[PDB]
Amino acid sequence: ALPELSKKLNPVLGYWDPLNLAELNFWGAGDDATVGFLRHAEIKHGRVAMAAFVGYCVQSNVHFPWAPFNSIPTNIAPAEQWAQLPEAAKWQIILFVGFLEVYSEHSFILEKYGQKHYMKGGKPGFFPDFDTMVHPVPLNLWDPLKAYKGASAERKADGLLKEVNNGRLAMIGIMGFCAEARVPGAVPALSNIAHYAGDPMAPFAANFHLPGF
Amino acid sequence: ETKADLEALAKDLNPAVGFWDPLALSDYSFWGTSQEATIGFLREAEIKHGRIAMAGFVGYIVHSNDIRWTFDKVAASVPTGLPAPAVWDAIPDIAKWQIILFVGVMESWRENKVVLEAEGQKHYMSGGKPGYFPSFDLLPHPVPFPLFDPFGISKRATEEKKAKGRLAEINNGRLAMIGLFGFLSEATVPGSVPFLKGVVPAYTGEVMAPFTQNIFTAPTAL
Amino acid sequence: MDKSGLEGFAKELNPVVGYWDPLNLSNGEFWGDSNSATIGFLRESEIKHGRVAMAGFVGYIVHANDIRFPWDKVAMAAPKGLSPQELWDVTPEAAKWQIILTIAFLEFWRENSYILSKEGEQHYMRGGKPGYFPTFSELPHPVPFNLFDPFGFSKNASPEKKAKGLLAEVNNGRLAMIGLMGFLSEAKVPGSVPALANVGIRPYAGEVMAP
Ligand SMILES: CC(=O)O[C@H]1CC(C)(C)C(=C=C/C(C)=C/C=C/C(C)=C/C=C/C=C(C)/C=C/C=C(\C)C(=O)C[C@@]23O[C@]2(C)C[C@@H](O)CC3(C)C)[C@](C)(O)C1
Numbered sequence: 001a002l003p004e005l006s007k008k009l010n011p012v013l014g015y016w017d018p019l020n021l022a023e024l025n026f027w028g029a030g031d032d033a034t035v036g037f038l039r040h041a042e043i044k045h046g047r048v049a050m051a052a053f054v055g056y057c058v059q060s061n062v063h064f065p066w067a068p069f070n071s072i073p074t075n076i077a078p079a080e081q082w083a084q085l086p087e088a089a090k091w092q093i094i095l096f097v098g099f100l101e102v103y104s105e106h107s108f109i110l111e112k113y114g115q116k117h118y119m120k121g122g123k124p125g126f127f128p129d130f131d132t133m134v135h136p137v138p139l140n141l142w143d144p145l146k147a148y149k150g151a152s153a154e155r156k157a158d159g160l161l162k163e164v165n166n167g168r169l170a171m172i173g174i175m176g177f178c179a180e181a182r183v184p185g186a187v188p189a190l191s192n193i194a195h196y197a198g199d200p201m202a203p204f205a206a207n208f209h210l211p212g213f
Numbered sequence: 214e215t216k217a218d219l220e221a222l223a224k225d226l227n228p229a230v231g232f233w234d235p236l237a238l239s240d241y242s243f244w245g246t247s248q249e250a251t252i253g254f255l256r257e258a259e260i261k262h263g264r265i266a267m268a269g270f271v272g273y274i275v276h277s278n279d280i281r282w283t284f285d286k287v288a289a290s291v292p293t294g295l296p297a298p299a300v301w302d303a304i305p306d307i308a309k310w311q312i313i314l315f316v317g318v319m320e321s322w323r324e325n326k327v328v329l330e331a332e333g334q335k336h337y338m339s340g341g342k343p344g345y346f347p348s349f350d351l352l353p354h355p356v357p358f359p360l361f362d363p364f365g366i367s368k369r370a371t372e373e374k375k376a377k378g379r380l381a382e383i384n385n386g387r388l389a390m391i392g393l394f395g396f397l398s399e400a401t402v403p404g405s406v407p408f409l410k411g412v413v414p415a416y417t418g419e420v421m422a423p424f425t426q427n428i429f430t431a432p433t434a435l
Numbered sequence: 436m437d438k439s440g441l442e443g444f445a446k447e448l449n450p451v452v453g454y455w456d457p458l459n460l461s462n463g464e465f466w467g468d469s470n471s472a473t474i475g476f477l478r479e480s481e482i483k484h485g486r487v488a489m490a491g492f493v494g495y496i497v498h499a500n501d502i503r504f505p506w507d508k509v510a511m512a513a514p515k516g517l518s519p520q521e522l523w524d525v526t527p528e529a530a531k532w533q534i535i536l537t538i539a540f541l542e543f544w545r546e547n548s549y550i551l552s553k554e555g556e557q558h559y560m561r562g563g564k565p566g567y568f569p570t571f572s573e574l575p576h577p578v579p580f581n582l583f584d585p586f587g588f589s590k591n592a593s594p595e596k597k598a599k600g601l602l603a604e605v606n607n608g609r610l611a612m613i614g615l616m617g618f619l620s621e622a623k624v625p626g627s628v629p630a631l632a633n634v635g636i637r638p639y640a641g642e643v644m645a646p
């Protein structure tokens with residue numbers, strides 16, 4: 001699937017897996033499971049990177065004028081804003097994304113909607129609607145307003161291709177932002193905004209230090 | 214009632230708006246009970262809230278303009294000129310607790326299977342009439358009047374007039390739930406209702422706080 | 436209206452220009468409706484923008500000339516020599532809300548398919564006449580003077596005259612948006628529109644689209 005998909009994404013280059021990562025048999029789950037996991041990982045990273053790019057650009061200039069967000073400046077690094085955020089807010093955000101992730105991982109639910117797990121014939125990135133949830137669920141994650149629920153089939157794959165490419169571009173973009181943030185001059189022509197000095201992969205560095213470190 | 218009955222009711226309340234449930238409470242099965250009973254509970258809730266809100270609108274106008282009873286000591290004890298939300302907070306808590314328990318006795322009377330089936334109706338969730346209130350015929354002790362029409366008026370009303378009146382009840386309730394909350398929101402949040410700026414006296418307390426002293430932590434006794 | 440009819444209508448609007456659609460918005464499915472629906476929505480949007488822009492051109496002139504009624508207190512009390520935007524911004528907040536809420540009710544009435552179907556029309560996306568504002572027959576209380584043509588000067592007009600009038604509506608509104616936005620631009624960034632520079636478009640120092 002990866003060869004044909006790569007040619008669809010960029011037919012000139014065709015296929016470039018220089019490290020043969022598809023060939024490597026991840027967790028001994030089979031090459032098909034490697035392909036499924038890798039495609040789902042690329043899509044997950046692309047979605048989160050696209051959102052993180054837009055969110056970084058927004059947070060560098062605007063904050064919500066109600067508390068606790070009104071107290072944060074916008075003239076600092078967005079990573080610094082996250083660092084200042086209260087410990088409870090950090091844990092709650094991470095727990096909410098954990099809910100979305102474990103709901104995506106729940107086999108019974110996406111099986112209800114007619115999908116399998118991403119590494120066994122599951123089309124990568126089919127998030128489920130919150131119908132199996134217990135109490136009222138007014139909206140969903142994908143197509144929350146049900147605007148384009150009746151989309152076109154060929155459009156439903158052209159959009160996947162565009163999503164993959166835009167996700168790749170956003171991966172490199174958000175990481176360029178983080179690079180210039182924690183290392184000034186890391187991305188030339190980007191050294192204009194924010195130079196916080198701390199690890200962005202430390203969700204609770206401001207709160208606590210894990211023992212042993 | 215069925216969802217078809219709700220659609221008909223909505224199209225009779227407002228032909229243009231029609232059935233306008235965008236959150237699907239009419240479809241969510243409440244407590245696992247059938248749609249015909251969730252519709253009953255939701256419709257009874259709409260009627261009841263509209264009732265209480267219409268009464269609350271008139272009462273808020275009465276309290277803000279200090280039209281008080283002339284021959285009671287509690288009203289005299291409450292200071293004059295207060296905001297209508299504060300005219301509730303300045304009362305002895307024992308009177309609040311008796312207003313609330315009066316509503317409790319009345320809403321225990323209403324939902325009673327025996328009284329309803331003696332008078333002929335059933336519960337609003339059991340296919341009965343939503344927004345009905347049984348009279349005090351099976352009461353332990355005699356009492357002079359019922360709640361709905363303590364006097365005789367509408368004892369000889371046509372079913373057409375009753376249907377028109379129930380439609381007007383639902384519509385006026387929908388409007389009064391918004392008018393009374395406009396009063397409360399302008400009182401506790403100035404410049405929230407744009408048209409009442411400088412009309413509704415301001416207020417600082419919580420209108421969703423019935424008793425001054427917290428009953429769950431430290432009540433007061435008399 | 437189908438896209439062939441859209442090309443035809445563009446030709447009637449201007450034989451020379453034709454179907455100038457550089458963004459191809461007509462060939463689309465907004466919110467997943469049909470192409471005919473997208474055409475209906477775009478047509479209603481164009482007609483409504485032209486209508487509001489035509490009224491806004493007249494209103495901007497009328498305000499810039501400080502022409503105010505001889506019976507009102509609010510306008511007569513409001514300061515004179517102001518720009519139209521300053522005049523709107525110093526209008527009372529309640530007055531602004533009544534204006535916007537009546538416009539809201541008119542939009543609701545226009546969109547309401549029950550009323551259009553009672554009058555033998557449909558919603559514009561679902562196949563119908565774009566820009567038709569229904570009468571007020573269905574109102575709870577029987578008002579006089581329906582919105583379009585309250586006194587009834589076009590009741591006996593012919594279909595051909597009406598089609599010509601709709602084409603004129605679209606084109607005149609097309610330049611009306613340009614004119615009103617020229618006034619707003621000249622009150623904002625000076626020298627945006629050269630020609631008005633002599634008349635002295637009353638400068639305004641706020642973002643109009645932020646009530
Ligand atoms: C310095 C130098 O020399 O080089 C570089 C260095 C470096 C760091 C790489 C740089 C960078 C950063 C870059 C270029 C970053 C790019 C980021 C990128 C590419 C960000 C995409 C976001 C997309 C989103 C949020 C999509 C939402 C999409 C949504 C919400 C949808 O509605 C989905 C949708 O499918 C539906 C459901 C319906 C369909 O009808 C179609 C649509 C789409 C509507 C520099 C500085 O610029 C230059």
Ligand SMILES: CC(=O)O[C@H]1CC(C)(C)C(=C=C/C(C)=C/C=C/C(C)=C/C=C/C=C(C)/C=C/C=C(\C)C(=O)C[C@@]23O[C@]2(C)C[C@@H](O)CC3(C)C)[C@](C)(O)C1
Nearest residue numbers: 135136242243244245394397398401402417418419420421
């Ligand atoms: C800002 C300021 O200063 O002032 C502002 C703020 C302030 C004071 C707050 C204001 C106010 C008043 C407001 C906003 C009041 C809000 C009141 C509100 C929102 C009251 C909910 C009651 C819910 C109940 C009883 C739930 C029962 C729940 C029960 C019994 C259930 O079983 C639930 C159920 O789900 C289960 C468990 C299973 C399902 O199968 C079935 C259902 C769904 C039934 C003002 C006027 O805006 C002014």
Ligand SMILES: CC(=O)O[C@H]1CC(C)(C)C(=C=C/C(C)=C/C=C/C(C)=C/C=C/C=C(C)/C=C/C=C(\C)C(=O)C[C@@]23O[C@]2(C)C[C@@H](O)CC3(C)C)[C@](C)(O)C1
Nearest residue numbers: 282283284285348349350351352353354355356357358359
């Ligand atoms: C402003 C001012 O100062 O004005 C002045 C004006 C003026 C005229 C000078 C004055 C006066 C005189 C007035 C106003 C006199 C009023 C007299 C009045 C109103 C006298 C009622 C009697 C009722 C009785 C005995 C009840 C029996 C009750 C019995 C037998 C019952 O068991 C009743 C009951 O059986 C029912 C009905 C039905 C059952 O279900 C329930 C029960 C079993 C409980 C005042 C006071 O000075 C004030």
Ligand SMILES: CC(=O)O[C@H]1CC(C)(C)C(=C=C/C(C)=C/C=C/C(C)=C/C=C/C=C(C)/C=C/C=C(\C)C(=O)C[C@@]23O[C@]2(C)C[C@@H](O)CC3(C)C)[C@](C)(O)C1
Nearest residue numbers: 267268270271367378385388389391392395396406407408
């Ligand atoms: C801000 C902006 O821009 O806008 C707005 C915002 C806001 C806040 C909404 C505004 C407001 C005010 C509003 C809309 C207020 C609405 C209030 C409302 C809707 C109040 C109904 C009471 C009904 C009662 C008490 C009925 C009793 C009826 C009873 C007890 C009956 O006897 C019924 C009856 O059937 C019987 C049993 C027998 C029959 O013979 C017939 C009759 C009728 C006798 C403003 C200020 O205007 C501006």
Ligand SMILES: CC(=O)O[C@H]1CC(C)(C)C(=C=C/C(C)=C/C=C/C(C)=C/C=C/C=C(C)/C=C/C=C(\C)C(=O)C[C@@]23O[C@]2(C)C[C@@H](O)CC3(C)C)[C@](C)(O)C1
Nearest residue numbers: 457458484487488491494495498519520522523612613616
């Ligand atoms: C060739 C070229 O260059 O482009 C190509 C490509 C491109 C761009 C894709 C194309 C296009 C489309 C175009 C050009 C579209 C333009 C649309 C445009 C320009 C639309 C304006 C609407 C204005 C409204 C609704 C105003 C309301 C105004 C109102 C309600 C008011 O402000 C009222 C008021 O002011 C008064 C009257 C008096 C004051 O006291 C108070 C205020 C201020 C409140 C074309 C056609 O293919 C051509």
Ligand code: KC2
Nearest residue numbers: 047048050051124125126127142156157159160162163166
């Ligand atoms: C941060 C969130 C996020 C972003 C920024 C983002 C952007 C883009 C872009 C880029 C501009 C395009 C063009 C695009 C297109 C499509 N997205 Mg997508 N998307 C996000 C999230 C999700 C989720 C959760 C799902 C999803 C889906 C689809 C499908 C459906 C295909 C089908 O069902 O056939 C199509 C066509 C569903 C799916 O399964 O995709 C594999 C699904 O559940 N997306 N998506």
Ligand code: KC2
Nearest residue numbers: 264265267268343344345346361374375378379381382385
């Ligand atoms: C403070 C509360 C309150 C208010 C503000 C209020 C307002 C209005 C308005 C508004 C303009 C109209 C037009 C209206 C009309 C009718 N009301 Mg109503 N009403 C209140 C309370 C009660 C109670 C307790 C009952 C009741 C009823 C009826 C019936 C009988 C129908 C039937 O017998 O078929 C009709 C026609 C009885 C019932 O059974 O309603 C289903 C009943 O028990 N109402 N009611």
Ligand code: KC2
Nearest residue numbers: 486487489490565566567568583596597600601603604607
């Ligand atoms: C402020 C707003 C406004 C302006 C500035 C404006 C200007 C012009 C001009 C410019 C010189 C012309 C030439 C013109 C012509 C026609 N207008 Mg028009 N119009 C405005 C508003 C409305 C509304 C609300 C309606 C309407 C209509 C018609 C019909 C009827 C056709 C028919 O009955 O078949 C014709 C011929 C009605 C309709 O059906 O429009 C689809 C209708 O409801 N107009 N209109």
